[PDB]
Symmetry: C3
Subunit: 116 residues, 3 copies
């Protein structure tokens, strides 16, 4: 298989592939696509109960520079992901409005190559 | 593969795995997870046309004790499921408000292990 | 694998299977199911920026004669698809309200057999 998955704590990016790898870590929560194909992304955002700062609650999934998903509901643990045909050089990014909006001991996301 | 699928009538739970099984029937509509991994759930709820009791229309998918999905629309045959990384001891449950809210000759849901 | 995918331009229907094929082109955007099973559909609709005719914006995905999906948002590039257990003789169709509602140089959809 080719899959990777960022989070949750105590972990960060972890990966499983053959050679060559289909994807590659770019940084926390962010990943780069090295092989064209059919990818299921998946993951869940569990909002943090206590959060009380000014910033509104929103979590954003990016495909490169484009938002591909928004998470607005601040009480449901929500699912992130979907089936995406991605191309080389493609990035993917989960981006929380505050850092403390979210329970990192329990929030994360990941990716699996399904086909070519 | 590892997959199972409850419904629709005339069937109930049916299963396909290797040894050991990744999941296991707990009861009608309810299933237990025996192997950690990446699961696609899927299935559809076709609301029953004639339904006229007092109880409001809602169908609920549970991951263990938590609602992971709600079905409110009572005219669309709706899709249930999603991509979920589940863990051992995890249950999953489809729970219709009335029993007669739904066309059981045509409603069901299922699961497939995608990876580890 | 068994997968097929219509679009985008300069391409049309393209296919990859073993023998026998699990699906078959019926015509542009339209496909027929020849093997029962678990199918992920996927694809994206990128609305066309300039579109100014009278017809309201809506794109519809059909399973046979039934709408299984509606695309109403005319500014988001939207995802189409989902996990579907389909049966033999089943068709699938993406149907744009106008033809010029959409950027065909960048809109499409596809299908992959996951299991039996």
């Amino acid at each position: 298989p080719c899959m990777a998955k960022f989070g949750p704590l105590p972990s960060k990016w972890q990966m499983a592939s053959s050679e060559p790898p289909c994807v590659n870590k770019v940084s926390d929560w962010k990943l780069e696509i090295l092989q064209n194909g059919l990818y299921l992304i998946y993951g869940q955002v569990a909002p943090n109960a206590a959060y009380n700062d000014v910033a509104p609650f929103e979590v954003r999934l990016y495909k490169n520079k484009d938002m591909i998903q928004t998470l607005t509901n601040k009480s449901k643990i929500q699912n992130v992901g979907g089936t995406y045909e991605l191309h080389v050089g493609d990035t993917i990014d989960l981006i929380f409005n505050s850092e403390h909006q979210v329970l990192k001991n329990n929030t994360y996301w990941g990716i699996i190559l399904l086909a070519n």
